[PDB]
Amino acid sequence: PNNLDSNVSQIVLKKFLPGFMSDLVLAKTVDRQLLAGEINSSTGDSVSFKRPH
């Protein structure tokens, strides 16, 4: 009987399978444009808006 398996090597191909993933729906729908760029270096770490009368 032949024994060949030291002739060859155990190969890990360079490819990845797919992972799982998740949906981002809250981010898209909350308010975006109102707080954009408002907290910056002149502001310190918070800022405020006005409640109605």
Next chain:
Amino acid sequence: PNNLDSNVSQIVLKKFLPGFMSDLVLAKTVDRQLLAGEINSSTGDSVSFKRPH
């Protein structure tokens, strides 16, 4: 009593009756691109891919 059976011959026409079939839907819809060509004579009897992190 005429005896005519040597006058004619037993014919088998050249046509076949239709036979039963089956369909291949699993081979069509699993993956092929990935594993194609990857087991060859440098490989031995098996090959490995990479789980994502």
